[PDB]
Amino acid sequence: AELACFCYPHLENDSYKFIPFNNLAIKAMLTAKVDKKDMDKFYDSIIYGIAPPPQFKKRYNTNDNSRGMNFETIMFTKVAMLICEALNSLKVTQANVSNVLSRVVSIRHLENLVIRKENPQDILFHSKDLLLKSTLIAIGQSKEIETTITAEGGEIVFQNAAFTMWKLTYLEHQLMPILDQNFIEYKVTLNEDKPISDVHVKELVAELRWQYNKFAVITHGKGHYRIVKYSSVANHADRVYATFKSNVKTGVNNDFNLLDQRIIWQNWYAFTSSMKQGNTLDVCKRLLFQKMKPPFKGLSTDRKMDEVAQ
Amino acid sequence: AELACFCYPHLENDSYKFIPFNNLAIKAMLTAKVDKKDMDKFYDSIIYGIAPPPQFKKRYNTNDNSRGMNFETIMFTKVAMLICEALNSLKVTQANVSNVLSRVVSIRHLENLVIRKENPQDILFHSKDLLLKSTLIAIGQSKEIETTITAEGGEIVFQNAAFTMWKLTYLEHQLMPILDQNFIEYKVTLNEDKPISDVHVKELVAELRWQYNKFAVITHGKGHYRIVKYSSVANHADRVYATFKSNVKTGVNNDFNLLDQRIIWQNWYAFTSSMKQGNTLDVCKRLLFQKMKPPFKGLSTDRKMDEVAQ
Amino acid sequence: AELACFCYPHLENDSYKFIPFNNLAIKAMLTAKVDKKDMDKFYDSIIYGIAPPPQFKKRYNTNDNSRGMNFETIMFTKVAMLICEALNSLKVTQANVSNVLSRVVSIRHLENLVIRKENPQDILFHSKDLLLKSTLIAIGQSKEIETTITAEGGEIVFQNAAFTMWKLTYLEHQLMPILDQNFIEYKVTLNEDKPISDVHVKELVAELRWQYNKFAVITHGKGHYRIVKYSSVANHADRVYATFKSNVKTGVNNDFNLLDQRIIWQNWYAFTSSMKQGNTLDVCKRLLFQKMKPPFKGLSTDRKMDEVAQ
Amino acid sequence: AELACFCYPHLENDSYKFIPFNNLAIKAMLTAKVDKKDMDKFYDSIIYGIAPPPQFKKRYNTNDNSRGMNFETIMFTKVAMLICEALNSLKVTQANVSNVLSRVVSIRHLENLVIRKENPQDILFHSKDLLLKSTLIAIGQSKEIETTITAEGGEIVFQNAAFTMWKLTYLEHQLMPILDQNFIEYKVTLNEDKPISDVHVKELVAELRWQYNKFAVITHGKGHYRIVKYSSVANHADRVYATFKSNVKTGVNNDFNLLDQRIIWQNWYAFTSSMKQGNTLDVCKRLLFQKMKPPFKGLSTDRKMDEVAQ
Amino acid sequence: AELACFCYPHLENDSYKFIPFNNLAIKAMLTAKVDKKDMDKFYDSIIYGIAPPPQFKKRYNTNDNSRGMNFETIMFTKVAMLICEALNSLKVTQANVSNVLSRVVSIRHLENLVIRKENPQDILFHSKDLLLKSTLIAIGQSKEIETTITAEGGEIVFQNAAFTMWKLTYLEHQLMPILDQNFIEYKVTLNEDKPISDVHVKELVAELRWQYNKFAVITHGKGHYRIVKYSSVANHADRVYATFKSNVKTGVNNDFNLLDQRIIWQNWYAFTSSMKQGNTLDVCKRLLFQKMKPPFKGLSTDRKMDEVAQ
Amino acid sequence: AELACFCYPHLENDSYKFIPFNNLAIKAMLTAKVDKKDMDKFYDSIIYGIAPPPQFKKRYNTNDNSRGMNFETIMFTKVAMLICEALNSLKVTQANVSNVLSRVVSIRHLENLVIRKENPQDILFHSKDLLLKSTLIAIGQSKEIETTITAEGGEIVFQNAAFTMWKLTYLEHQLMPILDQNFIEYKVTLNEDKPISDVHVKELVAELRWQYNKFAVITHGKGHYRIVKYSSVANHADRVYATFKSNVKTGVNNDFNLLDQRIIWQNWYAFTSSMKQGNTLDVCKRLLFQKMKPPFKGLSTDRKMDEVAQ
Ligand SMILES: [Cl-]
Ligand SMILES: [Cl-]
Ligand SMILES: [Cl-]
Ligand SMILES: [Cl-]
């Protein structure tokens, strides 16, 4: 959802500060009759403060909407506050406020950061600089790519010198849980944005081939791998291409890290390279479904024999 | 109940301060043998402090009374304290104490204000001036009429530029819950005590005609609308007329805002206008039951067609 | 779903008898690798008997399907048996079996008949002839239209000399419950398939205008009224037109009872009359959304005044 | 455990009938002081009838034994009765009784047959001949091998024209549940003891390679496949070799079906062929751990591409 | 309690049949005003039939009595019926009825027989002759002594060729449970009323010395051992002597089996022998408390060494 | 487990401070691919800090290990902190760190000290010096032997002027509970490390002979008695001899207090004296199983007679 679904701007001393919404103010907005010229303007619920613009009613779950977020949840306030602490660390100026609040962000990403920041074991609990760095990446206001230390988080299921693999815990989320209970997705972040030796690559590929043979190794171009069911990789291609097509239309630059060709699923590397080369959706998406028959041979066999022993 | 059911006066430096009762002191009073000359005097339970006058035993629920209040409830203390903070904001003088404590107030109104004041989202939590303004209206010690910001509260179910509609939550109340579970009443407050444009009136009427077609739009004259089942509007007429008749007998002024004729139910506007003109109960109450066949035509049809679309 | 989702044919003495499936046989089928030439043929699970054709896997809820039926439910067997008792009352011959089993039926309709037949208060519990009549209507193997005595059932919420109004209990169903919890639909059956006096029509219309003002009074042409939210009447038009278009294409006769023009919602009567006259979907569906401004005036006022009294 | 852990022989008319034990008689035996010469003889608990020989106390779970069976369970009686119905279908003669009761059988196998026989959907519920055939195989008193119809049972997770794959439900068993909760084993039975076409073999291998890539496909020689974790295949080799070594020592014939070489895990086919050829445990077990690098190429790729589509 | 607390006599054809009381008839009796001359006569509750004589109110637990029995329990009816089946197996004649109903019996003994008779594993469930034999012993209407097969029952904790040791389950009883929760008593019955070899005696003594070193081995003279805490053996002596003194006063014969001197606790054998010789309570009870320092040496050591091994 | 399973060293100002692990850092380590040369080195989980060396994965319970500790428990952190407070009270220097962290300690001992230190009634709650003294004994970094005041703790079941007897509460432990539920062990500490009069010895022996006749009185040489089931004393001998053999091999001194010969079980005193004299395991362990037939005669009889009285 848009950043304007969690906070409204308030100017103080020629520098903007952002204020979380009260969920009851959102609840009052959802019952409001509003002019068409006011659907983009912030809403005054007399009792509970400012509420998001009524054009955003879709974003909130009501008895009629199940495709929004659970704003009456404590996690909503926590996520909204996390957004505000990041936006207040910037000094957004008047010309930028509407664009920053127009930014679409992953709510599940922001909830997982809250889960990290409130965990005393997690480094994000102890480093406001790292927490702010991670959030600014999450809200698209940072040049840096997500690595392990700044990762969205979840359950660590594999780690080596170069990579950390996370199980995405979206089924347990308070604010915007994924509703299909058949959902499983993993995420492999780089521990350091640096060249990675071949043995650490083999360690990752061997674990993905053995433990996750039913999953595609793909990427959305932002610097980390996504471990995704093969039955859903076609939908990922649609969303990835919609994003790449949007930035060409919107003029904003499309920087797409294809990542390691020896790790990425071959068909996905073909579909993304062809997309980067400027092909149409139909052209490069047909490369997902065509079997290109053609590294690290015997990696699966080595792991299996290590299981037969021990 | 009377304000004396929650607090007793204590003089300090020629200015009165009011003290909430302990519920155990009330419990001791209910078991007390008292002279007739002492039924109006405050009762000394040796152990738990001062208790209300024994003439008020009716007001408290016992195994023999279910038509009083649940004084052994934490909400009793909270409501009593709310009354005291308001009475202490005045400086009631000796001549006035008995009349102020004689004031009959709506307990459900005072409980809903407690619910607002303890909610951090509600403006009453943050403005002691607004909370005191709202309470002084509730206890009949203010000239101003209840508007949205100072409203008794409840669930917001409709809002526009001019009005806020509340669902009265009396079935969930701790202190004096309504016992018929078939009860539903709403309340429409003015956001601002100001002339209201015709479009904002149409928005309200269209919502009441469509969403609340089984409810009468009436008023008790104190500046806001009451959305009331038609099956109970006859009882409202009795209470409204008893009040109007009392003030004529008691000499206190009867100021009765009939409110907008285009919003009020036609029969109720007739019964209240006729009452204001000085007619007997039988005369003006017969106007409730007689069908006067004779605004905003097609408002119900427009809303219905907006539902057929979308 | 198709009748073949509940039973398979077994020939005995040149007359067909139908046998319910075991749900474990269905469970075995859902895990079966099957040739393409065998997707229409009944499946032999060695252990649990015959299973439906693998082309019907969509009809059964699995972890991957939530848009099918809960076949592992006792209600599945009960519904399947109800289908078999009806099909065995016919003597389906070889040429007819595949067409009878191809018939698409409302599962929720069949579950409600089970609910009636197992209720000792219901006449369907006591008359196997009436139960068989009701089921044969439900599975499209009867000339007669559904009336009150043969109705699908549910909760009676209104009744007079001519009509019975049922609340459809689909949210509580075991086999194929409706998942949107915001669902409410009613159904008005004729007590007798006979001309109906004007006073009994007024009684129905007055109750629908007063108690169900937010609902459209429509029909799918099979002889009874459906009380449906205005927000969903557009979807009903799509399904009704798809059915009418199918029978023109499939050559099967389209007999569409428009029912009483004084009861049916005006726009729906226009959309269905125009459909019957042979117009395209776009032509007659635009009549749903256009406000035609133009019986029984003051019916709503009479009911409201009866509430103000008593 | 031995068959004598569930029943004792009782002679009637020169033909033996077997009687289940009462669990309280077993409980009395476990507290009994017994001579050494009587440890093999059946025990008379005065109150609860005959009890198994005290040499079998190991087989029963007590507070000191957790490696036996839960005899105080209703499933014990059910399994014991199942054994007796099978033994009574034979007419065991005096010379044979002690050997038949000496037979060691899989308790989990017998419990799963009880689960099948008490399920009205299962064919074993309806065919006493099939139930007796299945039990006689289970207790080693039949020439025939276990196929699908006579299978031990469990959850069907794959089926085609030639094979049925069962999930072994040992963690949920009442009588002798497997205690490691990390246990998962499957079992592939032949639907018919017959030559099997190559396409039905490919269907099985493709499902095992894709859905069970972390499992070894082995066999214990009795005519069906066992789908077993690679980490436990070494323990299976020990038990398989102990059995093969026992029959050579005990003189009883060792008939070991190696099954299809294109389905069995290559190393297991080598270890079992070498065992059949008469090699020592060390010789043929080293073939499990040595990687022999050398059917049905691209089967895994075809299944994966079918997932990318649909 | 007396047998008259469970049944009343009804004459049929010059032979008495006994009828259980209804507990509501007992409840009516407990609230009855009765003449003194009628305190021994059976009570007519008009509604619930005959009730026990009002002189027995002590025997029934009321809010004022906790030292009686829980007659409103299903076990009361079961015990009463068990008494009646035994009394009806006799043909009590007119002269005997009052004496038979005057017999005092152990209610806990009778409840344990009910527990045996309703257990399908127990031989008492299957032999009405054995059940009647056991009950007639329990109600003092049989010459035979309690042995294992006719035992009161409980939990078997030791058994050998000659003895069965029972844990008395009185804390779990429905009708008259022992209320001190610190109660533990065992009972050793003879399997056969026959001379017993020395090895079977050693087996018992070794188990009592090792497993029950804090318990006295005593007897009440009726042919079986009672395993009793040393802290309570003084109370057993009081009750045993009261019984022996009663029969000398009442003239009824005192037959007291001292049982095996090598098993009985030495002091108890002295106290009972001295009582049998006709000494006063003070004389023979002082032998309980005096330490007589003087079989089967090293029995405790052998058992302990068998534990160090294995 | 080793002390390195709870903390890692961090140098500050030429003196080492020890830091507890986060359990999530341990959880990340358990999923880590690590070189062989790094299995002894502390592991960096990027997110949760330092983790123990991967050679210690055995020590932590996972779904595959049930023979380790429950590190995700709050008690793990509490025990780790207790270790750190003790290690920080020393000033471990660089040469000593690896040896101190190599020390193997009883986790159950450390958990019981946590239970003492967090109990406001316990002196360890109030004396940081006594708590540190007790912990340093527990982690083998103190010359002093465990006495009552510094005891591991548990339930006091006997106490006199010289001894305190504790019931070891290992079945209720959070971190490393004993899993056999048949476990019972006691521990007798000296109240003061001083010669003990004969009457206080008799008091202890009389209580152990009477109340714990099924338990062996042994010791592991560290200055206190262990009350242990006879069935497990053979396993204690194995562990005691393994320890004594280790220190002779490892060169570290073997100081073994045999304790009072009148209290220790005779066979254990023989096995430990013979071990101290330098005999092989087989030689001195055979003295456990051989019955040496040969203090304080009549102690058991005196206690029993005190029970017969009172
Ligand atoms: Cl990405
Ligand atoms: Cl008002
Ligand atoms: Cl219809
Ligand atoms: Cl096999």
Ligand SMILES: [Cl-]
């Ligand atoms: Cl006795």
Ligand SMILES: [Cl-]
């Ligand atoms: Cl020790």
